[PDB]
Amino acid sequence: QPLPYDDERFADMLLEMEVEGSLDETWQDGRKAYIEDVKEILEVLRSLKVRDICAIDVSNKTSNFDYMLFGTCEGPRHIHLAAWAVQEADALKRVCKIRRKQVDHTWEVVPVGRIIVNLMQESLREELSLERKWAVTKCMDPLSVANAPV
Amino acid sequence: RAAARRMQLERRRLEASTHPPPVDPTAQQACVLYRRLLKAGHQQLLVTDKSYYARKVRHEFEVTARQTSARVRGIMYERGQWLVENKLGGI
Amino acid sequence: LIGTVMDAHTEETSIKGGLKVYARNEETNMMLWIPPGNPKLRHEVTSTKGSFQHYLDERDKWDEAWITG
């Protein structure tokens, strides 16, 4: 009764650790983002007339953010205005503002704690499909590390 | 140790060869997967735009599958099944 | 991260301790020394025992990765 994973011993150890209830206890954290905040940001973007708003949860998947938001805007001015609106909505817990001189005239990212909002143009959004990558990437399987190095 | 590692690698290669490879789904399977994805998205998602999600999945099915090879098409079919089973990975 | 234990500085609880680990992500192989008593680096040996054969093969993997790098 072998195991498909390359390192059978380590894979069995990881499976036992996960089942006994230790990985969850070690990784438990209560700093998760809020779907309520995600929905509020969605409403702000809709009011500002942003197109194609997507909210992809990444908490389960290995990443550095939770509930990534993606939106497409008609121009750099619209991107800047939407970023300012998002920052104003976050004004309560906001610690700093975005640059007033748009460095990238086709991509602006506003980090809101665990949540991050990316406003791009249609061309750049189609070029880099971050939404597709973060929707297709599989969740954090503890046994996934039981494979050969690369 | 090197000989043992080589023997294990040969055994794993034999097991992989015994196991079947990925295959390209047929038209009926693709349509069923697309319908399941659309229905699951409509029932689950509340923040993302349903129309945009439908358009993106339609574009994926009608473009990326054709552009890629049969193995990639089978991998994408399996990934779509996984998404349907695991709530689209969060949307 | 999930890794093995390459070495341990001391055999008994003490501030002058430390433990080595070999974490291996998708395409990253990082060998790191973690000291105990740090409130932010919560490191826990998840198993009650270890296998020397596992240590040997993991060490071989790390050596190969380091040589290739």
Partner: peptide, 25 residues
């Protein structure tokens, strides 16, 4: 013998996104 070498960056974005785990395994 113990490490697997692959060229993922050469593949297209769609392949490297939808077949990363399959290729890694």
């Amino acid at each position: 013998a113990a490490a697997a070498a692959a060229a993922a960056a050469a593949a297209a974005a769609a392949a490297a996104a939808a077949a990363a785990a399959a290729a890694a395994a």
